[PDB]
Ligand binder design. Structure first.
Ligand SMILES: N=[N+]=NC[C@H]1O[C@@H](n2c(SCC(=O)O)nc3c(N)ncnc32)[C@H](O)[C@@H]1O
Length: 336
């Protein structure tokens, strides 16, 4: 068995000549002796913590059912032949050169690249929502790119089925997804069970593609909202009246009036069409926030918009021991 930086990689014999990439998991590249190409392989060791088992089952179940050019596929899954012997799971994927988080650390994107990246994000997200699934953790590091700038959404560990009938909750309720990309209703009255929470994160991603800096880099839970309101300004009477929870409404009413900051003042080099779509994704009221199919038809994406080339899903959509059993069952098709 080949090893890489301490831990081992029981991926032989089909996958050889491993190389570290990054890091209860770990990712390396490997040579696929069957297909004669180098691939990506991530090792997952989740079975002692149930929250890890949850993320693993969600990711595997969803990605095995999804097939889309802008969503990372699972080509293979390696694991022990029995439940007792299964400690680790290996997910094999197409090899990508980088991700958008790493690329934004050092590279200035041209408007052509920004436009092409955004189109691909929304084309993939269109498929996800057509399956009645919410990603719930979209961010630059979950967008993979290869050497010809093909983009694929990855990491579905927090994804769930949309449930807008049960989205309402109290003020300041606990949340899991990545802070800088959370919509304002998360901190006020929403469990994040509707499609609008993904669109907000994509808006945050567009803004970050425009300046190589996160637009709302909150340092803690409620600080996230202060950042969002410092740029969007105070919510209108109509948006406030849609918030019936008294604690959340009275918090917003307790704030001093704040003016909206113009997008063209924040991003003076940006294309005006990109800023118009930005505004519609980063809308405060989630019922007014643009949807993914509307975003694809925005003039900014006119060079690429082709609804017959933007396919949708055919088939839309517990303790540690059952989850490990279900992961074993879900991966049996690649045995062996
Ligand atoms: N895990 N982790 N972090 C370590 C590193 O993995 C990198 N990476 C992932 S990570 C997918 C996921 O997050 O599920 N997939 C791939 C892939 N197909 N090809 C190349 N690189 C990948 C990601 O760029 C980060 O640098």
């Amino acid at each position: 068995p080949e090893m890489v930086r301490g831990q081992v990689f029981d991926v032989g014999p089909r996958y050889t000549n491993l190389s570290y990439i990054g890091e209860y998991g770990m990712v390396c590249s490997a040579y696929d002796n069957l297909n004669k190409v180098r691939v990506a392989i991530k090792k997952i060791s989740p079975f002692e913590h149930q929250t890890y088992c949850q993320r693993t089952l969600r990711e595997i179940k969803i990605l095995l059912r999804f097939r889309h050019e802008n969503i990372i596929g699972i080509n293979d899954i390696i694991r022990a032949p029995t439940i007792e012997q299964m400690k680790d799971v290996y997910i094999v994927q197409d090899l990508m050169e980088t991700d958008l988080y790493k690329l934004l650390k050092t590279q200035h994107l041209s408007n052509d690249h920004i436009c092409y990246f955004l189109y691909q994000i929304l084309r993939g997200l269109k498929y996800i929502h057509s399956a009645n699934v919410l990603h719930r953790d979209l961010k630059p590091s979950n967008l993979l790119l290869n050497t010809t700038c093909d983009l694929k959404i990855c990491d579905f560990g927090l994804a769930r089925v949309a449930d807008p009938d049960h989205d309402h909750t109290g003020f300041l309720t606990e949340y899991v997804a990545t802070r800088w990309y959370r919509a304002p209703e998360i901190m006020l009255n929403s469990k994040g069970y509707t499609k609008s929470i993904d669109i907000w994160s994509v808006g945050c991603i567009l803004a970050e593609m425009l300046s190589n800096r996160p637009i709302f880099p909150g340092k803690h839970y409620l600080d996230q909202l202060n950042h969002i309101l410092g740029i969007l300004g105070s919510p209108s009477q109509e948006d406030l009246n849609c918030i019936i929870n008294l604690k959340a409404r009275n918090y917003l009413l307790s704030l001093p009036h704040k003016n909206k900051v113009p997008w063209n003042r924040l991003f003076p080099n940006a294309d005006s069409k990109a800023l118009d779509l930005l505004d519609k994704m980063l809308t405060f009221n989630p019922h007014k926030r643009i949807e993914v199919e509307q975003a694809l038809a925005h003039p900014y994406l006119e060079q690429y918009y082709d609804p017959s080339d933007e396919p949708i899903a055919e088939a839309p959509f517990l303790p540690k021991e059952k989850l490990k059993e279900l992961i074993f069952e879900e991966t049996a098709r690649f045995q062996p």
